Design a protein around this motif. Sequence first.
Motif, mmCIF file in Angstrom:
data_model
loop_
_atom_site.group_PDB
_atom_site.id
_atom_site.type_symbol
_atom_site.label_atom_id
_atom_site.label_comp_id
_atom_site.label_asym_id
_atom_site.label_seq_id
_atom_site.Cartn_x
_atom_site.Cartn_y
_atom_site.Cartn_z
ATOM 1 N N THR A 94 0.846 -1.185 0.000
ATOM 2 C CA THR A 94 0.000 0.000 0.000
ATOM 3 C C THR A 94 0.886 1.239 0.000
ATOM 4 O OG1 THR A 94 -0.186 -0.008 2.419
ATOM 5 C CG2 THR A 94 -1.879 -1.183 1.176
ATOM 6 N N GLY A 95 0.271 2.388 -0.266
ATOM 7 C CA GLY A 95 0.981 3.650 -0.231
ATOM 8 C C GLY A 95 1.413 4.055 1.162
ATOM 9 N N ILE A 96 0.552 3.813 2.154
ATOM 10 C CA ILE A 96 0.861 4.218 3.523
ATOM 11 C C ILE A 96 2.078 3.464 4.045
ATOM 12 C CG2 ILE A 96 -0.718 2.541 4.580
ATOM 13 C CD1 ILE A 96 -0.112 6.163 5.794
ATOM 14 N N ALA A 97 2.174 2.168 3.741
ATOM 15 C CA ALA A 97 3.318 1.389 4.203
ATOM 16 C C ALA A 97 4.616 1.893 3.582
ATOM 17 C CB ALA A 97 3.107 -0.089 3.884
ATOM 18 N N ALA A 98 4.596 2.190 2.282
ATOM 19 C CA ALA A 98 5.781 2.733 1.628
ATOM 20 C C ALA A 98 6.148 4.099 2.186
ATOM 21 C CB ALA A 98 5.555 2.819 0.120
ATOM 22 N N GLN A 99 5.150 4.930 2.484
ATOM 23 C CA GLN A 99 5.418 6.225 3.101
ATOM 24 C C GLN A 99 6.071 6.057 4.468
ATOM 25 O OE1 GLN A 99 2.327 9.646 2.867
ATOM 26 N NE2 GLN A 99 2.536 9.180 5.051
ATOM 27 N N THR A 100 5.581 5.109 5.266
ATOM 28 C CA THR A 100 6.176 4.866 6.574
ATOM 29 C C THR A 100 7.610 4.369 6.442
ATOM 30 O OG1 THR A 100 3.975 4.311 7.414
ATOM 31 C CG2 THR A 100 5.867 3.699 8.769
ATOM 32 N N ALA A 101 7.864 3.478 5.482
ATOM 33 C CA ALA A 101 9.228 3.013 5.253
ATOM 34 C C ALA A 101 10.130 4.164 4.827
ATOM 35 C CB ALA A 101 9.240 1.904 4.204
ATOM 36 N N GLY A 102 9.615 5.063 3.989
ATOM 37 C CA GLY A 102 10.392 6.227 3.601
ATOM 38 C C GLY A 102 10.713 7.126 4.777
ATOM 39 N N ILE A 103 9.745 7.324 5.671
ATOM 40 C CA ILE A 103 9.992 8.145 6.854
ATOM 41 C C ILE A 103 11.040 7.491 7.748
ATOM 42 C CG2 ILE A 103 8.971 9.099 8.939
ATOM 43 C CD1 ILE A 103 6.297 9.236 7.254
ATOM 44 N N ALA A 104 10.945 6.175 7.944
ATOM 45 C CA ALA A 104 11.923 5.484 8.779
ATOM 46 C C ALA A 104 13.325 5.573 8.185
ATOM 47 C CB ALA A 104 11.512 4.026 8.959
ATOM 48 N N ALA A 105 13.444 5.343 6.875
ATOM 49 C CA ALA A 105 14.741 5.454 6.220
ATOM 50 C C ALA A 105 15.280 6.872 6.318
ATOM 51 C CB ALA A 105 14.631 5.027 4.757
ATOM 52 N N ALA A 106 14.415 7.871 6.135
ATOM 53 C CA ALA A 106 14.862 9.254 6.213
ATOM 54 C C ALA A 106 15.336 9.603 7.615
ATOM 55 C CB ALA A 106 13.742 10.192 5.775
ATOM 56 N N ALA A 107 14.655 9.099 8.644
ATOM 57 C CA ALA A 107 15.096 9.357 10.013
ATOM 58 C C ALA A 107 16.464 8.736 10.271
ATOM 59 C CB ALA A 107 14.067 8.821 11.005
ATOM 60 N N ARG A 108 16.623 7.454 9.930
ATOM 61 C CA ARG A 108 17.907 6.811 10.185
ATOM 62 C C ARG A 108 19.026 7.356 9.304
ATOM 63 N NH1 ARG A 108 14.408 2.332 11.032
ATOM 64 N NH2 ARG A 108 14.671 1.583 8.889
ATOM 65 N N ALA A 109 18.703 7.974 8.167
ATOM 66 C CA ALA A 109 19.722 8.627 7.352
ATOM 67 C C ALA A 109 20.046 10.027 7.860
ATOM 68 C CB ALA A 109 19.268 8.695 5.893
ATOM 69 N N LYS A 110 19.046 10.743 8.376
ATOM 70 C CA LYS A 110 19.304 12.014 9.043
ATOM 71 C C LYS A 110 20.239 11.820 10.223
ATOM 72 C CE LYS A 110 15.992 15.817 8.765
ATOM 73 N NZ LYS A 110 14.740 16.395 9.338
ATOM 74 N N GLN A 111 20.076 10.723 10.952
ATOM 75 C CA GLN A 111 20.984 10.485 12.075
ATOM 76 C C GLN A 111 22.432 10.202 11.629
ATOM 77 O OE1 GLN A 111 18.674 11.820 14.376
ATOM 78 N NE2 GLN A 111 19.941 10.541 15.719
ATOM 79 N N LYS A 112 22.745 10.192 10.327
ATOM 80 C CA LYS A 112 24.111 10.025 9.844
ATOM 81 C C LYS A 112 24.548 11.193 8.965
ATOM 82 C CE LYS A 112 24.158 4.982 10.090
ATOM 83 N NZ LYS A 112 24.309 3.705 9.346
ATOM 84 N N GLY A 113 23.868 12.333 9.059
ATOM 85 C CA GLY A 113 24.294 13.532 8.366
ATOM 86 C C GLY A 113 23.817 13.682 6.941
ATOM 87 N N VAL A 114 22.764 12.977 6.540
ATOM 88 C CA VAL A 114 22.255 13.045 5.175
ATOM 89 C C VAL A 114 21.148 14.089 5.119
ATOM 90 C CG1 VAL A 114 21.193 11.777 3.288
ATOM 91 C CG2 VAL A 114 22.851 10.643 4.772
ATOM 92 N N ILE A 115 21.245 15.003 4.155
ATOM 93 C CA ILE A 115 20.212 16.008 3.925
ATOM 94 C C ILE A 115 19.720 15.885 2.489
ATOM 95 C CG2 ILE A 115 19.677 18.465 3.862
ATOM 96 C CD1 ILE A 115 22.608 17.250 5.948
ATOM 97 N N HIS A 116 20.621 16.083 1.530
ATOM 98 C CA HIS A 116 20.280 15.961 0.120
ATOM 99 C C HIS A 116 20.475 14.526 -0.350
ATOM 100 C CE1 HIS A 116 21.359 20.343 0.417
ATOM 101 N NE2 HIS A 116 20.207 20.418 -0.222
ATOM 102 N N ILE A 117 19.589 14.070 -1.233
ATOM 103 C CA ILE A 117 19.663 12.724 -1.786
ATOM 104 C C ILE A 117 19.322 12.755 -3.268
ATOM 105 C CG2 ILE A 117 19.244 11.472 0.359
ATOM 106 C CD1 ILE A 117 16.286 11.258 -0.528
ATOM 107 N N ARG A 118 19.845 11.770 -3.991
ATOM 108 C CA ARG A 118 19.455 11.474 -5.363
ATOM 109 C C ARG A 118 18.626 10.198 -5.335
ATOM 110 N NH1 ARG A 118 25.143 10.969 -8.274
ATOM 111 N NH2 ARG A 118 25.805 10.257 -6.205
ATOM 112 N N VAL A 119 17.410 10.262 -5.859
ATOM 113 C CA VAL A 119 16.478 9.143 -5.781
ATOM 114 C C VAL A 119 16.617 8.288 -7.034
ATOM 115 C CG1 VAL A 119 14.040 8.518 -5.852
ATOM 116 C CG2 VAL A 119 14.846 10.233 -4.228
#
Lengths: 96, 137, 133, 98, 86
Positions: free
Chosen positions: B67-92
Amino acid sequence: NEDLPISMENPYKEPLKKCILCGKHVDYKNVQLLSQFVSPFTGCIYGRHITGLCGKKQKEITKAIKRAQIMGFMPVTYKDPAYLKDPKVCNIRYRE
Amino acid sequence: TKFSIYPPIPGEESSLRWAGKKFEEIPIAHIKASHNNTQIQVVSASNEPLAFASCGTEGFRNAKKGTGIAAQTAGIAAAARAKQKGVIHIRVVVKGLGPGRLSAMHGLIMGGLEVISITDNTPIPHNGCRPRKARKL
Amino acid sequence: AGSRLETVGSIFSRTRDLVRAGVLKEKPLWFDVYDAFPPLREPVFQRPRVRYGKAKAPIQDIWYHEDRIRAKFYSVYGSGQRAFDLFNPNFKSTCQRFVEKYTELQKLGETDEEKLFVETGKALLAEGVILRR
Amino acid sequence: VESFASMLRHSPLTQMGPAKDKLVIGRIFHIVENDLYIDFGGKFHCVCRRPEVDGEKYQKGTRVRLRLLDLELTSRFLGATTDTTVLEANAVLLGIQE
Amino acid sequence: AKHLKFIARTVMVQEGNVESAYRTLNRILTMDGLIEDIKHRRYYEKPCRRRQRESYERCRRIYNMEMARKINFLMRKNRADPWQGC
RNA sequence: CCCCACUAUGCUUAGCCCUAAACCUCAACAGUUAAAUCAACAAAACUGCUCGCCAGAACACUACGAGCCACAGCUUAAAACUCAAA
Ligand code: FES
Ligand SMILES: [K+]
Ligand SMILES: [Mg+2]
Ligand SMILES: [Mg+2]
Ligand SMILES: [Mg+2]
């Protein structure tokens, strides 16, 4: 009577239309010319309804592109970025 | 200067910078959007994994993963754990045409990362392997 | 009343056969006039046929000598900025002036198409007609 | 006695040659709101829209300048053995003949 | 696999408009025929069915263009009646 | 009928087998567009010449005989009884 019409070929006959590559040699080493007939984003060869070429030159361009691709002269999955600023001859718009 | 839709070339020097870094140094978010799952992995430009999140690692099970909601939640989780390592800009880099193709990117944006480019790498054979037969439903 | 088989013969032949057969008491008003002044073709029904194979219509294309000159004139000096007036039965275009001068030079000189063209252009410019290539 | 061949040969319409992109003088003979019916000496008339500039000057009897595109608009369509004609000529209205 | 990355099928974001970039990428993939290829490659299409589909599509396009040309050609006559009453 | 796993088979080499809605369901060559165009539909109607084939249905893409690297396989292919239809 001298006023009767006479038999001749049509003198007003306009010349037959020619493609932009008419009379020009297509070489597989001319990656610049071949790159003008492929998609910038996917490298897919454009059909004649986009390129406007005649069947003979469409076939020539297709064969040249495939030859250059397999002999390591041209990329396959994209257009070489060095030729992205070349004149646009294809009737396609991505609204980019 | 006119905005260029085309990505910068590594060789040809360009003035585009993001927090002082060139295009070829930005981290990459790889999204794999399958039909029943969406997996997101953030890696460094040198291919060092920083974060990973899928719909299954976020607790969703069976059909709820696709579903869309599950993918959105996975994106939020990945973004949080990447923010905790100094990531701001990304190439998708998105691969596949599943339900989470766009929702994962939305979740990445809502998690705080800034998308500077979108790339599609969905596998398209030039007629290699033979696909399976159609379902007779 | 006469026979309503419009696809058999013509009105004249049907009427004449019926009159001589005694079906019609009197000739119709138009029968004598048709007798005295018949049409060029008897109006007999005929079904138009599509042509196939090598059959072609005998209609020819109407061409004249000067058409060639006209064509090349229209290819060099283009269509005159002046406007045609087709209502005037004796309208004279720039191209027609060029044609008449070309024919005059042809009958007063040699036959070299390019030389005739350039000479005629010179003559028209001398007369005072603008001609932009 | 002038024969038909001579009249055809010396006719202005015959002299005009091809009708494409030829400038002609036409006369307005019928008005239907903003539709101008113009005769230019051909078999068929052309119907033009009234220009937005000096539209009041275009009246019945007015002489106008036209660019002819086709003397008769015809075209053969799929599954037809004869051409379909709209019984009209194609032209562009340029302005009024001064 | 052997090609350079971040050149093919790549779109840059303008002023943080990620949605517009994604929609532009979707358009590019659609008009390049990649979306239909991906969707048609999920299951195997038999050669006879593939040939029939292509023939049908080609003739449908030709017929539709001819019909559109006919309608547009006949549209010129659709104006106010010049001989109303008679 | 959906999901998973996995065979013969789909591939290469050397041999068999010889069947298709193997169909443009149009035999090969040459010619014509004038005739009443023409049962219908299909794909406008015909002419000359040659070869192949067909003479109610079913029995029967069958039985027998014969031939074939084929062994309940392929090609050729009937008769009796029955019916007024097909
Ligand atoms: S038209 Fe001349 S080669 Fe294409
Ligand atoms: K068939
Ligand atoms: Mg034979
Ligand atoms: Mg029988
Ligand atoms: Mg048998």
